[PDB]
Amino acid sequence: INTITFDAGNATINKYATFMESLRNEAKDPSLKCYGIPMLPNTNSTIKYLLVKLQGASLKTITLILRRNNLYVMGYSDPYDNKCRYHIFNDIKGTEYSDVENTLCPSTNPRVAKPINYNGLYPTLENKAGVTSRNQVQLGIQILSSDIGKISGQGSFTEKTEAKFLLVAIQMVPEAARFKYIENQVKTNFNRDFFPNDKVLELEENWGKISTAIHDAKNGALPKPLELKNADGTKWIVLRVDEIKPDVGLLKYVNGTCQTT
Numbered sequence: 001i002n003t004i005t006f007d008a009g010n011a012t013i014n015k016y017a018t019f020m021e022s023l024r025n026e027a028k029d030p031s032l033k034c035y036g037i038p039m040l041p042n043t044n045s046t047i048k049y050l051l052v053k054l055q056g057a058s059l060k061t062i063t064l065i066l067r068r069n070n071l072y073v074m075g076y077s078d079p080y081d082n083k084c085r086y087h088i089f090n091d092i093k094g095t096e097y098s099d100v101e102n103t104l105c106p107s108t109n110p111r112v113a114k115p116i117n118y119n120g121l122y123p124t125l126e127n128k129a130g131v132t133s134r135n136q137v138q139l140g141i142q143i144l145s146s147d148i149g150k151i152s153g154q155g156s157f158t159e160k161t162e163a164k165f166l167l168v169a170i171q172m173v174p175e176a177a178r179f180k181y182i183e184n185q186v187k188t189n190f191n192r193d194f195f196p197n198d199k200v201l202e203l204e205e206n207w208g209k210i211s212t213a214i215h216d217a218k219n220g221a222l223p224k225p226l227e228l229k230n231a232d233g234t235k236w237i238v239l240r241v242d243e244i245k246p247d248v249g250l251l252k253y254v255n256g257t258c259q260t261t
């Protein structure tokens with residue numbers, strides 16, 4: 001399967017929806033699903049990485065590389081100085097590392113490294129972005145396009161600029177694929193900058209717990225109450241798969257059989 005592209009400089013809600021549908025369709029294991037929700041593959045599947053090319057209104061691009069099995073961003077590349085410049089997180093090493101480097105920038109064309117001197121965990125990114133919480137960093141289509149312009153092809157840019165771009169891209173691409181609720185936040189705020197609400201953050205932080213609960217659910221009942229948060233930050237108690245299913249687009253891989261429909 002090849003590169004999925006999203007044009008943030010010429011986007012519409014329908015194009016963003018199509019993009020999410022393509023990302024989910026290529027990331028999901030061809031057959032795993034629980035309660036009708038597609039699940040990502042185990043660590044030894046057919047295709048290991050997905051490339052997602054984002055284009056800004058400047059026409060410049062940034063391509064993210066996602067580990068297909070869990071959708072984490074491994075790094076990104078940008079066309080720079082007539083070379084392919086690859087930026088990989090500092091905890092990616094060995095095989096994986098050279099696999100990421102070569103997938104972003106094939107050894108048959110000019111290339112150059114520009115390390116990401118930190119890892120991709122949210123607290124790390126928030127620290128580099130200079131915020132106590134990513135809910136202080138606005139998301140949005142125009143913001144994504146602008147961040148692409150600030151980095152792509154640029155010989156110089158700060159870690160703060162890069163970490164903010166990463167906070168935006170991670171949440172508008174893989175988190176939105178994982179959660180229809182997040183995709184929907186982008187679609188209902190399509191023409192404006194917006195701060196992610198408490199439910200967005202809570203879903204991002206509990207994807208594994210939510211995926212395990214749905215996978216382990218019997219006749220639609222979660223193993224035990226699942227405590228999350230409503231959009232306004234208040235406590236939300238979920239007892240059944242159907243109460244949370246509307247918000248979920250992809251399940252993290254959970255071993256073993258499950259009620260598939």
Ligand SMILES: *[C@@H]1O[C@H](CO)[C@@H](O)[C@H](O)[C@H]1NC(C)=O
Pocket residue numbers: 255256257
């Ligand atoms: C995964 O599940 C199968 C299918 O039930 C089981 O044979 C295997 O023990 C499990 N793997 C792990 C690590 O628990």
